Amino acid sequence: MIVNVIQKDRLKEQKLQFIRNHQQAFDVEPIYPLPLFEDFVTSIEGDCSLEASCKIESDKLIASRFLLFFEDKTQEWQKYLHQSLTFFGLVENRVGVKINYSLLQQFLGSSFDFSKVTVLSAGIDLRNNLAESSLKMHIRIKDYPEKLDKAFALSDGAADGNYLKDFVNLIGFDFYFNGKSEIEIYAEVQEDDFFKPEINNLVWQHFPKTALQPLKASSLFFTGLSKANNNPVLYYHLKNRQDLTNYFKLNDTAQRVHSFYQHQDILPYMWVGTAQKELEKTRIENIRLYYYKSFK
């Protein structure tokens, strides 16, 4: 029992540490309301992962981006959903904002089968301009075509085609502090399928050649579809974060992020997000970089 007490406290601090490392590297002052997210990660007692992230816009570094993945192998999805929403409510109270939940409500509907959930995340993407700040949630669904149809319908035409239902498992929800909300659909291709002719037919031949190059170093590929996106966002899951510079032509700002992370005590893999037209360039100007730590 005493072992559990030590480990509990240890995990709490290790999580805050990962968060502080990231914030302290890129922002002298924490963006409000980061301390509320810090309290939320602390309140979660099971096994989790954290994502710390930077969005680079030329020389603009946006670094107050964090996500928690519920990974306690009990599969208590409804419990985790209720904890996430409780946290979101607290943010509403302290900040004095009202979140628009309608897209999540319609997606959940009345009959949600939680046994079909394989990932749940909750988090923040915080700005100095409160209105531009957002709360985030992802839900990954397996063998739930009824819910896939719903999310596609909710996309409001950002869903490029109904043939993409074959590729979609992850659903993203953004909740802006100004009462605007967005849904995102992520079309995926796994590594085992990269070289299949059906995949070349339905996916690869629609992308320029430069978009295909980072697949060599990747275990997974998403295309993020949302009407909040200026362009389709291509996501590459690099097996080793060290390969970033080999496959992506980084600007100074993104190199700074890359440099900081090369020798942090974090997971070997990373995610990279960039618009298709950035890869056509001689130097990427707009890029999203995602780093991970697990806490068992």
Binding site: F69, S121, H138, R140, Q190, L220, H237, Y269, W271, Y292
Partner: peptide, 7 residues
């Protein structure tokens, strides 16, 4: 495998 894909 990773936090966005269970295995």
């Amino acid at each position: 495998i990773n936090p966005y894909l269970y295995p």
